[PDB]
Design a protein around this ligand. Structure first.
Ligand SMILES: O=C(O)c1ccccc1Nc1ccccc1
Length: 136
């Protein structure tokens, strides 16, 4: 198989900045202790593409998580804060759009390339957090 547009996401990434993540976690419903420990974490994210399967791994002192998925096809995910969610990830004009549904709630995580960075925008209702990753 040849190159794909989403190969722009492939690589090893490290968190370099975070804004409003505590408030995002509060809106999601994360409890105090998990918010405190998760907010300290400086994760690395490892993204790879093999055929139609995209894999995103996160490694940190808080948790190590991994999802593999095909665009547009719903899957089960256990999040770092231990939510059991139903997730669907699509590509919208170069942006990976990840919707998680659980307990009648929903949150959207968008991942996009900007300059040499990978920007992750996490949205829960009116609350947005921006997390910026650079190449490791
Ligand atoms: O998703 C990860 O791997 C992750 C890694 C470090 C810190 C937080 C993380 N995610 C997260 C935590 C609470 C609510 C929503 C998402």
């Amino acid at each position: 198989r040849g190159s794909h547009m989403c190969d722009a996401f492939v690589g090893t990434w490290k968190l370099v900045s975070s804004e409003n993540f505590d408030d995002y976690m509060k809106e999601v419903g994360v409890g105090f202790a998990t918010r405190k420990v998760a907010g300290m974490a400086k994760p690395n994210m490892i993204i790879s593409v093999n055929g139609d399967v995209i894999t995103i791994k996160s490694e940190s002192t808080f948790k190590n998580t991994e999802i593999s998925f095909i665009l547009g096809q719903e899957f089960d995910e256990v999040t770092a804060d231990d939510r059991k969610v139903k997730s669907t990830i699509t590509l919208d004009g170069g942006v990976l759009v990840h919707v998680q549904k659980w307990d009648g709630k929903s949150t959207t995580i968008k991942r996009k390339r900007e300059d040499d960075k990978l920007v992750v925008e996490c949205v829960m209702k009116g609350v947005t957090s921006t997390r910026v990753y650079e190449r490791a």
